[PDB]
Design a protein around this ligand. Structure first.
Ligand SMILES: CC(=O)N1c2ccc(-c3ccc(C(=O)O)cc3)cc2[C@H](Nc2ccc3ccsc3c2)C[C@@H]1C
Length: 113
């Protein structure tokens, strides 16, 4: 599958925020939330659609994002899920915001579709 130039830059941004360089921030978002493994109460009462870095990579590479905004929607969904279930004073929300600020800075430089 050949990606647009905008989505190619999105792929490279995804690999950056998912890389070992940011392992202290992204390892909580690398894989789908597992309510049983994490002992979560009411997760899907609060979160209607789960999202994580592995799933965004799958969708991107299988052609499910038509524009860079479709890709950015899922990234934003991943972080907003974390903020609203865990609370912005939680440790996981605090590292999330750090990772999102990194992503926001880079995504601003992507050319139009
Ligand atoms: C992202 C998100 O909303 N979540 C999330 C997702 C994944 C993980 C996670 C933890 C350990 C491992 C592991 O290596 O085996 C893998 C994944 C933790 C969390 C969150 N829990 C959590 C607890 C204490 C702390 C303390 C500092 S941060 C932190 C995060 C829950 C939440 C639903």
């Amino acid at each position: 599958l050949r990606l647009s130039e905008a989505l190619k830059a999105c792929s490279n941004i995804l690999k950056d925020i998912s890389s070992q360089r940011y392992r202290d921030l992204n390892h909580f978002f690398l894989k789908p939330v597992d309510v049983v493994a994490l002992g979560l109460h009411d997760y899907y009462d609060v979160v209607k659609k789960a999202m994580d870095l592995s799933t965004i990579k799958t969708k991107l590479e299988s052609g499910q994002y038509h524009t860079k905004y479709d890709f950015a929607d899922d990234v934003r969904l991943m972080f907003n899920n974390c903020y609203k279930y865990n609370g912005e004073d939680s440790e996981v929300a605090r590292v999330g915001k750090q990772l999102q600020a990194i992503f926001d800075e880079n995504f601003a430089k992507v050319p139009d579709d």
